[PDB]
Amino acid sequence: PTINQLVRKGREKVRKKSKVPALKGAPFRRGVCTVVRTVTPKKPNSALRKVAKVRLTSGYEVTAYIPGEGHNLQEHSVVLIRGGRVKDLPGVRYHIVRGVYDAAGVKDRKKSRSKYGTKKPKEAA
Amino acid sequence: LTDPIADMLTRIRNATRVYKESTDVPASRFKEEILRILAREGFIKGYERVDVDGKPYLRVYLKYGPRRQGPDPRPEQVIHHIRRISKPGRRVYVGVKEIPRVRRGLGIAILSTSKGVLTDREARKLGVGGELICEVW
RNA sequence: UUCCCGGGCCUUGUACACACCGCCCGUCACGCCAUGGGAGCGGGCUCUACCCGAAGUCGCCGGGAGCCUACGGGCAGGCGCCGAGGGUAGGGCCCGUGACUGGGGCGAAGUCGUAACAAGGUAGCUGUACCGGAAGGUGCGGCUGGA
RNA sequence: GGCUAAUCCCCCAUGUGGACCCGCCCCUUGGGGUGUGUCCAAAGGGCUUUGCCCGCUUCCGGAUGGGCCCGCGUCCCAUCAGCUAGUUGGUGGGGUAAUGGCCCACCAAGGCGACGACGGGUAGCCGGUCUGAGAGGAUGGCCGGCCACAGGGGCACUGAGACACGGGCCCCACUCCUACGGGAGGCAGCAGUUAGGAAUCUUCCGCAAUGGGCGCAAGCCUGACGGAGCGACGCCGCUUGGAGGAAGAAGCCCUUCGGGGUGUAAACUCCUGAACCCGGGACGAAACCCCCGACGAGGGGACUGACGGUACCGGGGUAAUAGCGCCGGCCAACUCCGUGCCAGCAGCCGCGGUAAUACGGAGGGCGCGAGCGUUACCCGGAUUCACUGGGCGUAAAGGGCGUGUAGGCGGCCUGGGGCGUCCCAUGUGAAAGACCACGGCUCAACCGUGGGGGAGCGUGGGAUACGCUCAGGCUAGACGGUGGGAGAGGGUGGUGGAAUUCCCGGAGUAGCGGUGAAAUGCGCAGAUACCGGGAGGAACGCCGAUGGCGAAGGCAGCCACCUGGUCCACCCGUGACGCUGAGGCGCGAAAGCGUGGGGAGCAAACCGGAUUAGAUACCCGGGUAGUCCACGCCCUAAACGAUGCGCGCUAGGUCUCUGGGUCUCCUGGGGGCCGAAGCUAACGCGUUAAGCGCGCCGCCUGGGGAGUACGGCCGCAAGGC
Ligand SMILES: [Mg+2]
Ligand SMILES: [Mg+2]
Ligand SMILES: [Mg+2]
Ligand SMILES: [Mg+2]
Ligand SMILES: [Mg+2]
Ligand SMILES: [Mg+2]
Ligand SMILES: [Mg+2]
Ligand SMILES: [Mg+2]
Ligand SMILES: [Mg+2]
Ligand SMILES: [Mg+2]
Ligand SMILES: [Mg+2]
Ligand SMILES: [Mg+2]
Ligand SMILES: [Mg+2]
Ligand SMILES: [Mg+2]
Ligand SMILES: [Mg+2]
Ligand SMILES: [Mg+2]
Ligand SMILES: [Mg+2]
Ligand SMILES: [Mg+2]
Ligand SMILES: [Mg+2]
Ligand SMILES: [Mg+2]
Ligand SMILES: [Mg+2]
Ligand SMILES: [Mg+2]
Ligand SMILES: [Mg+2]
Ligand SMILES: [Mg+2]
Ligand SMILES: [Mg+2]
Ligand SMILES: [Mg+2]
Ligand SMILES: [Mg+2]
Ligand SMILES: [Mg+2]
Ligand SMILES: [Mg+2]
Ligand SMILES: [Mg+2]
Ligand SMILES: [Mg+2]
Ligand SMILES: [Mg+2]
Ligand SMILES: [Mg+2]
Ligand SMILES: [Mg+2]
Ligand SMILES: [Mg+2]
Ligand SMILES: [Mg+2]
Ligand SMILES: [Mg+2]
Ligand SMILES: [Mg+2]
Ligand SMILES: [Mg+2]
Ligand SMILES: [Mg+2]
Ligand SMILES: [Mg+2]
Ligand SMILES: [Mg+2]
Ligand SMILES: [Mg+2]
Ligand SMILES: [Mg+2]
Ligand SMILES: [Mg+2]
Ligand SMILES: [Mg+2]
Ligand SMILES: [Mg+2]
Ligand SMILES: [Mg+2]
Ligand SMILES: [Mg+2]
Ligand SMILES: [Mg+2]
Ligand SMILES: [Mg+2]
Ligand SMILES: [Mg+2]
Ligand SMILES: [Mg+2]
Ligand SMILES: [Mg+2]
Ligand SMILES: [Mg+2]
């Protein structure tokens, strides 16, 4: 443009969109589940990913992913919502924290167990 | 014409890109001071007042480098680059603390002060500054 | 050497490159997601007009009715305007929701057809109008993103 | 109802002085002085007393704090374009410490707004903080300054100051006490409870220091403050040992089983010595107090700690917590086993469907370390909002074209102002934060001291090169004058022929049209083909093209009228009159719409007949709107050179259109090709730039959803922006 067009109009700032509508910037949202089921991903993959549709305290009712191998989640489980999407699962934009409320950690996991929420074992060590 | 100084410097640029002996810019007092600075620093071979069809022009005699060897035998420019800063649509005015370094002192920023039309070092030594017309290197 | 099959060289075109046994378009069928319209339903914000209108400043009265420490004055009290707010009536804006309905996107490999990409077998595209399950077809005019 | 005292109230007196009206003088918007008239003061208390101290009243001046006003700056939505009833200005009053339309009467009709009014949404603001090379972007938590609130809302009183957290009155909502009729309350103070939420603490100690209030002082009050307690919440510092130690124990992992790794790692030997035990034990604290001295200056003496027996010092003295992320590329770290598009991993690319360095474990390695990862938000990378620092022929993007308002920009010479601009001085720019230097806590974090400037704004002085203004002059820009030129430029009226169809007349036969081939269809009711005449409508062959005109759409027989644009020569006149252009306005192919007219040929829709598996198509025969005209709409496009306009510069060769000339040739405008330098990612552009520069406008910020929805405007509608 010209200099006069920058005086009359100026530049337009970015004004991005938050990918996580978790009510005004909360890193974690407590929620009670409604429906716990398994879904199917997009074509490039094929599995049975474990999910849960969670009615949480912001009035929203979203679906979240259940990480790890095995879970103890049911129709009336109180979970915590973490954030971050799953790419192969449309509609899933959230994760369930394990080791909190009613979502226990992955049993017998030892390498990466802070994430997935498992205590330190002690095999006489 | 809108800015006659940008016309003069662009005509000098197009003369340098085709290796012409001399060209004709229209005559002005401020243009004559700019050509005085370009002759004092050694970017041109000087100017003279001429009259083309009874109308005053200026013979800017160009300066170039030695005729190089190897492929593309065009000599290196004296005026590698020339560009007006204080545009008639966007005026630039600087103080004495705001005069730029120009290619680590190798170039020049011709700028207009209250004490006449000066260079970057002459505006720092006298300590005046003003409208920063163009840069030449 | 026109024809059908395979082949070699040059050139042209391509939206093909698992390389035409390529690619690709649209309707219809099922599921899910977000969304428009929608007889209306519920809520929030705000504007205008009027009625009622507490406390309280201010302005009169302070008299057939009171009290006073200095009275042709004061206090109490009474009347009036404004008055928070409540009510009534009509507007404006926004949000959720609504039988049904339009189209959008993603899915499992579904049904029907061949639109476009090579002169894609009617050159293609576009504006407009009409018509047809559907891509689309045709009429007028325009472009080379073809000869 | 009745006494009663004051630093409580009232009255009288004097008046330094002050207030008020009038007049005058200086100044000059309510400042100061002066003369008459009037009004306005007071309070006592304590000693070591007829001497001080604390107080009182009036006024002037100083200091501090505050009220009010003004210049400039301060988020998003233009899908919010018109707003304004005390609204804008004046006059006279009320009120205030005080201007003010702050409020009330009367008069006038003004005031604001594209330089973004009004409206809608959001937000306390700043010094600062985070990021960033900078420019910028984001933010306002702790600390400091200003504002505004004290459950919502309204209101006044006391008072120098409040429209007042812990003061008052009223209404609504809530809690509690009620003998039911009427009363108390306001944690957004310090702790603490409940609800919400991912999440935020102690119902601690002390007035010892600083500070605040009262008091002559002693002294009293202070959840301000000084501290302690809790939470790895952040930062900084320290510890879980150090030195030796086998050609290298065991376990475990890999193995081309010979071996390699964990690995000086361990066990083991010496040594220092966290935590613990004992003893001592503060800095922060010196005044206010008292004495001498005139309770002045100056000298001397005495009391007072919460933190806290804490930091710290001395001696003794124990081998004493390690965990977390990762190991396919970005990106540092590789093997084995289990699994086999399952389980699963994931920030992108993407891995896993039998030999996976990507899934799970183990060994080992890498990165940090009392931390490590994850999530949420901000900046960066992002030069993907480009001032620095981007683009628009084909990727995103030149408005369909012109006229033109505001605005932006603007030729040459010489003077005046000195507004922008520059220089100097001065004031401000608080403190704290940041930078540098030196120190206090044993370092650091933290803190203190000193220095140094930023930016902006007020004031004074100086300069005129450039931008601005005023004035004088100049002609290269622009326009005009004279004399000519070419052209399908536009509108109106008229007119010529070729050809098609139809009607009439002659003559004439068994077929004509049509296709790839056929068929529908037309034809002995006398067709096609032939001639003659008549009617009607539309488009103008040859000239005629790589041509011309126009701003674009577009414009083609000829003649006449009306009319615009444009080019050349003469260099005659005005003399900077110029360029662009947000809106507005006008033009705007074709299709379509309304009213009327016309309709020969063509030809959407429609009907047949073929092809085809099917044909709503391609092919053929018919055929209605439309195509034609007048007027009024519609405003779209591959409206394309997918290239906005104006100006200046930068090799040429060649074809052609149109003027002039001193006609081998030169010069001006215009239409094409090839190509210097140069540009582009390439194709390509190349003085008819997509090159080099300036001025201005329009437009773009991944694809789809989508030129869709809602809103607004226009249209009869289709629909358009
Ligand atoms: Mg051969
Ligand atoms: Mg094929
Ligand atoms: Mg729907
Ligand atoms: Mg709806
Ligand atoms: Mg509705
Ligand atoms: Mg109802
Ligand atoms: Mg098929
Ligand atoms: Mg096809
Ligand atoms: Mg075709
Ligand atoms: Mg086709
Ligand atoms: Mg058709
Ligand atoms: Mg056509
Ligand atoms: Mg006196
Ligand atoms: Mg008196
Ligand atoms: Mg707020
Ligand atoms: Mg940057
Ligand atoms: Mg409260
Ligand atoms: Mg108070
Ligand atoms: Mg309180
Ligand atoms: Mg809770
Ligand atoms: Mg104290
Ligand atoms: Mg004190
Ligand atoms: Mg050791
Ligand atoms: Mg060894
Ligand atoms: Mg071993
Ligand atoms: Mg002490
Ligand atoms: Mg590596
Ligand atoms: Mg990985
Ligand atoms: Mg692994
Ligand atoms: Mg540390
Ligand atoms: Mg940036
Ligand atoms: Mg970013
Ligand atoms: Mg720029
Ligand atoms: Mg770009
Ligand atoms: Mg494009
Ligand atoms: Mg154009
Ligand atoms: Mg114009
Ligand atoms: Mg100028
Ligand atoms: Mg000035
Ligand atoms: Mg400062
Ligand atoms: Mg002049
Ligand atoms: Mg002349
Ligand atoms: Mg039109
Ligand atoms: Mg038409
Ligand atoms: Mg019509
Ligand atoms: Mg009629
Ligand atoms: Mg026909
Ligand atoms: Mg077929
Ligand atoms: Mg059949
Ligand atoms: Mg036909
Ligand atoms: Mg074209
Ligand atoms: Mg030419
Ligand atoms: Mg070319
Ligand atoms: Mg998009
Ligand atoms: Mg459209």
PDB file of all heavy atoms in Angstrom, chain D residues 628-636:
ATOM      1  P     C D 628     -31.862  -7.580 -30.675  1.00  0.00           P
ATOM      2  OP1   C D 628     -30.593  -6.926 -31.085  1.00  0.00           O
ATOM      3  OP2   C D 628     -32.456  -7.232 -29.363  1.00  0.00           O
ATOM      4  O5'   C D 628     -32.948  -7.286 -31.800  1.00  0.00           O
ATOM      5  C5'   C D 628     -32.590  -7.271 -33.172  1.00  0.00           C
ATOM      6  C4'   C D 628     -33.575  -6.461 -33.966  1.00  0.00           C
ATOM      7  O4'   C D 628     -34.805  -7.218 -34.138  1.00  0.00           O
ATOM      8  C3'   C D 628     -34.032  -5.176 -33.298  1.00  0.00           C
ATOM      9  O3'   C D 628     -33.109  -4.108 -33.425  1.00  0.00           O
ATOM     10  C2'   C D 628     -35.365  -4.917 -33.973  1.00  0.00           C
ATOM     11  O2'   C D 628     -35.172  -4.387 -35.277  1.00  0.00           O
ATOM     12  C1'   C D 628     -35.914  -6.343 -34.110  1.00  0.00           C
ATOM     13  N1    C D 628     -36.816  -6.742 -32.995  1.00  0.00           N
ATOM     14  C2    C D 628     -38.087  -6.152 -32.815  1.00  0.00           C
ATOM     15  O2    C D 628     -38.473  -5.257 -33.590  1.00  0.00           O
ATOM     16  N3    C D 628     -38.867  -6.566 -31.788  1.00  0.00           N
ATOM     17  C4    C D 628     -38.442  -7.516 -30.955  1.00  0.00           C
ATOM     18  N4    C D 628     -39.256  -7.891 -29.964  1.00  0.00           N
ATOM     19  C5    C D 628     -37.179  -8.151 -31.125  1.00  0.00           C
ATOM     20  C6    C D 628     -36.416  -7.739 -32.143  1.00  0.00           C
ATOM     21  P     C D 629     -32.943  -3.049 -32.227  1.00  0.00           P
ATOM     22  OP1   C D 629     -31.767  -2.190 -32.523  1.00  0.00           O
ATOM     23  OP2   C D 629     -32.999  -3.796 -30.946  1.00  0.00           O
ATOM     24  O5'   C D 629     -34.252  -2.148 -32.322  1.00  0.00           O
ATOM     25  C5'   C D 629     -34.511  -1.364 -33.477  1.00  0.00           C
ATOM     26  C4'   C D 629     -35.812  -0.613 -33.360  1.00  0.00           C
ATOM     27  O4'   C D 629     -36.929  -1.538 -33.323  1.00  0.00           O
ATOM     28  C3'   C D 629     -35.987   0.216 -32.101  1.00  0.00           C
ATOM     29  O3'   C D 629     -35.307   1.457 -32.158  1.00  0.00           O
ATOM     30  C2'   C D 629     -37.498   0.362 -32.011  1.00  0.00           C
ATOM     31  O2'   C D 629     -37.961   1.372 -32.896  1.00  0.00           O
ATOM     32  C1'   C D 629     -37.973  -0.995 -32.540  1.00  0.00           C
ATOM     33  N1    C D 629     -38.331  -1.959 -31.466  1.00  0.00           N
ATOM     34  C2    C D 629     -39.500  -1.801 -30.692  1.00  0.00           C
ATOM     35  O2    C D 629     -40.236  -0.818 -30.868  1.00  0.00           O
ATOM     36  N3    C D 629     -39.789  -2.710 -29.727  1.00  0.00           N
ATOM     37  C4    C D 629     -38.996  -3.760 -29.535  1.00  0.00           C
ATOM     38  N4    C D 629     -39.321  -4.641 -28.583  1.00  0.00           N
ATOM     39  C5    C D 629     -37.817  -3.948 -30.306  1.00  0.00           C
ATOM     40  C6    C D 629     -37.537  -3.052 -31.259  1.00  0.00           C
ATOM     41  P     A D 630     -34.809   2.165 -30.806  1.00  0.00           P
ATOM     42  OP1   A D 630     -33.914   3.291 -31.176  1.00  0.00           O
ATOM     43  OP2   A D 630     -34.323   1.101 -29.890  1.00  0.00           O
ATOM     44  O5'   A D 630     -36.137   2.780 -30.179  1.00  0.00           O
ATOM     45  C5'   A D 630     -36.854   3.806 -30.849  1.00  0.00           C
ATOM     46  C4'   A D 630     -38.028   4.267 -30.025  1.00  0.00           C
ATOM     47  O4'   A D 630     -39.099   3.291 -30.096  1.00  0.00           O
ATOM     48  C3'   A D 630     -37.761   4.413 -28.537  1.00  0.00           C
ATOM     49  O3'   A D 630     -37.117   5.629 -28.210  1.00  0.00           O
ATOM     50  C2'   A D 630     -39.152   4.270 -27.934  1.00  0.00           C
ATOM     51  O2'   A D 630     -39.885   5.480 -28.061  1.00  0.00           O
ATOM     52  C1'   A D 630     -39.775   3.227 -28.856  1.00  0.00           C
ATOM     53  N9    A D 630     -39.637   1.860 -28.325  1.00  0.00           N
ATOM     54  C8    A D 630     -38.721   0.925 -28.728  1.00  0.00           C
ATOM     55  N7    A D 630     -38.818  -0.217 -28.100  1.00  0.00           N
ATOM     56  C5    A D 630     -39.875  -0.027 -27.229  1.00  0.00           C
ATOM     57  C6    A D 630     -40.479  -0.876 -26.290  1.00  0.00           C
ATOM     58  N6    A D 630     -40.073  -2.128 -26.071  1.00  0.00           N
ATOM     59  N1    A D 630     -41.509  -0.386 -25.566  1.00  0.00           N
ATOM     60  C2    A D 630     -41.910   0.875 -25.782  1.00  0.00           C
ATOM     61  N3    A D 630     -41.421   1.769 -26.646  1.00  0.00           N
ATOM     62  C4    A D 630     -40.393   1.251 -27.347  1.00  0.00           C
ATOM     63  P     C D 631     -35.945   5.645 -27.112  1.00  0.00           P
ATOM     64  OP1   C D 631     -35.221   6.937 -27.230  1.00  0.00           O
ATOM     65  OP2   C D 631     -35.198   4.365 -27.219  1.00  0.00           O
ATOM     66  O5'   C D 631     -36.729   5.645 -25.729  1.00  0.00           O
ATOM     67  C5'   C D 631     -37.689   6.650 -25.445  1.00  0.00           C
ATOM     68  C4'   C D 631     -38.626   6.230 -24.342  1.00  0.00           C
ATOM     69  O4'   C D 631     -39.418   5.086 -24.763  1.00  0.00           O
ATOM     70  C3'   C D 631     -37.980   5.755 -23.053  1.00  0.00           C
ATOM     71  O3'   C D 631     -37.481   6.795 -22.237  1.00  0.00           O
ATOM     72  C2'   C D 631     -39.099   4.949 -22.413  1.00  0.00           C
ATOM     73  O2'   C D 631     -40.071   5.810 -21.838  1.00  0.00           O
ATOM     74  C1'   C D 631     -39.721   4.278 -23.642  1.00  0.00           C
ATOM     75  N1    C D 631     -39.195   2.903 -23.854  1.00  0.00           N
ATOM     76  C2    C D 631     -39.778   1.859 -23.121  1.00  0.00           C
ATOM     77  O2    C D 631     -40.709   2.130 -22.344  1.00  0.00           O
ATOM     78  N3    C D 631     -39.322   0.595 -23.281  1.00  0.00           N
ATOM     79  C4    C D 631     -38.319   0.348 -24.125  1.00  0.00           C
ATOM     80  N4    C D 631     -37.901  -0.915 -24.255  1.00  0.00           N
ATOM     81  C5    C D 631     -37.705   1.382 -24.887  1.00  0.00           C
ATOM     82  C6    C D 631     -38.170   2.626 -24.722  1.00  0.00           C
ATOM     83  P     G D 632     -36.145   6.546 -21.381  1.00  0.00           P
ATOM     84  OP1   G D 632     -35.729   7.842 -20.790  1.00  0.00           O
ATOM     85  OP2   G D 632     -35.198   5.780 -22.232  1.00  0.00           O
ATOM     86  O5'   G D 632     -36.624   5.598 -20.195  1.00  0.00           O
ATOM     87  C5'   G D 632     -37.569   6.060 -19.243  1.00  0.00           C
ATOM     88  C4'   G D 632     -38.110   4.940 -18.387  1.00  0.00           C
ATOM     89  O4'   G D 632     -38.743   3.927 -19.208  1.00  0.00           O
ATOM     90  C3'   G D 632     -37.095   4.157 -17.576  1.00  0.00           C
ATOM     91  O3'   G D 632     -36.667   4.841 -16.415  1.00  0.00           O
ATOM     92  C2'   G D 632     -37.843   2.864 -17.281  1.00  0.00           C
ATOM     93  O2'   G D 632     -38.773   3.056 -16.225  1.00  0.00           O
ATOM     94  C1'   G D 632     -38.624   2.666 -18.580  1.00  0.00           C
ATOM     95  N9    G D 632     -37.954   1.718 -19.491  1.00  0.00           N
ATOM     96  C8    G D 632     -37.186   1.977 -20.603  1.00  0.00           C
ATOM     97  N7    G D 632     -36.748   0.889 -21.184  1.00  0.00           N
ATOM     98  C5    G D 632     -37.256  -0.149 -20.413  1.00  0.00           C
ATOM     99  C6    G D 632     -37.122  -1.559 -20.537  1.00  0.00           C
ATOM    100  O6    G D 632     -36.509  -2.214 -21.391  1.00  0.00           O
ATOM    101  N1    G D 632     -37.802  -2.229 -19.524  1.00  0.00           N
ATOM    102  C2    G D 632     -38.528  -1.625 -18.527  1.00  0.00           C
ATOM    103  N2    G D 632     -39.126  -2.432 -17.640  1.00  0.00           N
ATOM    104  N3    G D 632     -38.657  -0.318 -18.398  1.00  0.00           N
ATOM    105  C4    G D 632     -38.001   0.352 -19.366  1.00  0.00           C
ATOM    106  P     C D 633     -35.267   4.454 -15.734  1.00  0.00           P
ATOM    107  OP1   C D 633     -34.899   5.541 -14.792  1.00  0.00           O
ATOM    108  OP2   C D 633     -34.326   4.061 -16.816  1.00  0.00           O
ATOM    109  O5'   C D 633     -35.608   3.152 -14.884  1.00  0.00           O
ATOM    110  C5'   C D 633     -34.696   2.070 -14.818  1.00  0.00           C
ATOM    111  C4'   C D 633     -35.403   0.774 -14.514  1.00  0.00           C
ATOM    112  O4'   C D 633     -36.001   0.242 -15.724  1.00  0.00           O
ATOM    113  C3'   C D 633     -34.514  -0.350 -14.013  1.00  0.00           C
ATOM    114  O3'   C D 633     -34.250  -0.253 -12.624  1.00  0.00           O
ATOM    115  C2'   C D 633     -35.301  -1.598 -14.387  1.00  0.00           C
ATOM    116  O2'   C D 633     -36.321  -1.856 -13.433  1.00  0.00           O
ATOM    117  C1'   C D 633     -35.964  -1.170 -15.700  1.00  0.00           C
ATOM    118  N1    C D 633     -35.268  -1.656 -16.922  1.00  0.00           N
ATOM    119  C2    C D 633     -35.263  -3.017 -17.291  1.00  0.00           C
ATOM    120  O2    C D 633     -35.809  -3.877 -16.586  1.00  0.00           O
ATOM    121  N3    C D 633     -34.636  -3.399 -18.430  1.00  0.00           N
ATOM    122  C4    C D 633     -34.045  -2.494 -19.207  1.00  0.00           C
ATOM    123  N4    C D 633     -33.443  -2.918 -20.322  1.00  0.00           N
ATOM    124  C5    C D 633     -34.044  -1.109 -18.875  1.00  0.00           C
ATOM    125  C6    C D 633     -34.665  -0.744 -17.747  1.00  0.00           C
ATOM    126  P     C D 634     -32.743  -0.342 -12.078  1.00  0.00           P
ATOM    127  OP1   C D 634     -32.758  -0.090 -10.614  1.00  0.00           O
ATOM    128  OP2   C D 634     -31.902   0.510 -12.956  1.00  0.00           O
ATOM    129  O5'   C D 634     -32.329  -1.861 -12.332  1.00  0.00           O
ATOM    130  C5'   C D 634     -33.058  -2.933 -11.749  1.00  0.00           C
ATOM    131  C4'   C D 634     -32.788  -4.232 -12.464  1.00  0.00           C
ATOM    132  O4'   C D 634     -33.140  -4.102 -13.863  1.00  0.00           O
ATOM    133  C3'   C D 634     -31.336  -4.683 -12.483  1.00  0.00           C
ATOM    134  O3'   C D 634     -30.975  -5.369 -11.297  1.00  0.00           O
ATOM    135  C2'   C D 634     -31.259  -5.559 -13.729  1.00  0.00           C
ATOM    136  O2'   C D 634     -31.693  -6.880 -13.446  1.00  0.00           O
ATOM    137  C1'   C D 634     -32.284  -4.898 -14.655  1.00  0.00           C
ATOM    138  N1    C D 634     -31.660  -4.052 -15.699  1.00  0.00           N
ATOM    139  C2    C D 634     -31.175  -4.655 -16.868  1.00  0.00           C
ATOM    140  O2    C D 634     -31.263  -5.885 -17.009  1.00  0.00           O
ATOM    141  N3    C D 634     -30.612  -3.880 -17.825  1.00  0.00           N
ATOM    142  C4    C D 634     -30.530  -2.561 -17.653  1.00  0.00           C
ATOM    143  N4    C D 634     -29.968  -1.840 -18.625  1.00  0.00           N
ATOM    144  C5    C D 634     -31.025  -1.923 -16.480  1.00  0.00           C
ATOM    145  C6    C D 634     -31.575  -2.698 -15.541  1.00  0.00           C
ATOM    146  P     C D 635     -29.824  -4.792 -10.338  1.00  0.00           P
ATOM    147  OP1   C D 635     -29.562  -5.821  -9.308  1.00  0.00           O
ATOM    148  OP2   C D 635     -30.185  -3.414  -9.919  1.00  0.00           O
ATOM    149  O5'   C D 635     -28.551  -4.695 -11.287  1.00  0.00           O
ATOM    150  C5'   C D 635     -27.739  -5.836 -11.547  1.00  0.00           C
ATOM    151  C4'   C D 635     -26.333  -5.438 -11.925  1.00  0.00           C
ATOM    152  O4'   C D 635     -26.380  -4.821 -13.240  1.00  0.00           O
ATOM    153  C3'   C D 635     -25.683  -4.423 -10.979  1.00  0.00           C
ATOM    154  O3'   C D 635     -24.377  -4.806 -10.467  1.00  0.00           O
ATOM    155  C2'   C D 635     -25.697  -3.104 -11.764  1.00  0.00           C
ATOM    156  O2'   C D 635     -24.606  -2.245 -11.506  1.00  0.00           O
ATOM    157  C1'   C D 635     -25.727  -3.568 -13.224  1.00  0.00           C
ATOM    158  N1    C D 635     -26.452  -2.649 -14.119  1.00  0.00           N
ATOM    159  C2    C D 635     -26.171  -2.660 -15.489  1.00  0.00           C
ATOM    160  O2    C D 635     -25.336  -3.466 -15.926  1.00  0.00           O
ATOM    161  N3    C D 635     -26.826  -1.805 -16.310  1.00  0.00           N
ATOM    162  C4    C D 635     -27.722  -0.951 -15.810  1.00  0.00           C
ATOM    163  N4    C D 635     -28.336  -0.122 -16.658  1.00  0.00           N
ATOM    164  C5    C D 635     -28.026  -0.906 -14.419  1.00  0.00           C
ATOM    165  C6    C D 635     -27.371  -1.760 -13.622  1.00  0.00           C
ATOM    166  P     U D 636     -23.042  -5.159 -11.318  1.00  0.00           P
ATOM    167  OP1   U D 636     -22.024  -5.404 -10.268  1.00  0.00           O
ATOM    168  OP2   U D 636     -22.675  -4.186 -12.373  1.00  0.00           O
ATOM    169  O5'   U D 636     -23.314  -6.586 -11.962  1.00  0.00           O
ATOM    170  C5'   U D 636     -23.427  -7.751 -11.161  1.00  0.00           C
ATOM    171  C4'   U D 636     -23.499  -8.983 -12.023  1.00  0.00           C
ATOM    172  O4'   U D 636     -24.419  -8.741 -13.122  1.00  0.00           O
ATOM    173  C3'   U D 636     -22.201  -9.373 -12.712  1.00  0.00           C
ATOM    174  O3'   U D 636     -21.315 -10.095 -11.874  1.00  0.00           O
ATOM    175  C2'   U D 636     -22.689 -10.162 -13.919  1.00  0.00           C
ATOM    176  O2'   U D 636     -23.059 -11.478 -13.537  1.00  0.00           O
ATOM    177  C1'   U D 636     -23.960  -9.392 -14.290  1.00  0.00           C
ATOM    178  N1    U D 636     -23.728  -8.379 -15.355  1.00  0.00           N
ATOM    179  C2    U D 636     -23.637  -8.795 -16.676  1.00  0.00           C
ATOM    180  O2    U D 636     -23.735  -9.960 -17.024  1.00  0.00           O
ATOM    181  N3    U D 636     -23.424  -7.793 -17.595  1.00  0.00           N
ATOM    182  C4    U D 636     -23.297  -6.440 -17.346  1.00  0.00           C
ATOM    183  O4    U D 636     -23.106  -5.653 -18.275  1.00  0.00           O
ATOM    184  C5    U D 636     -23.405  -6.085 -15.970  1.00  0.00           C
ATOM    185  C6    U D 636     -23.615  -7.039 -15.061  1.00  0.00           C
TER     186        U D 636
END
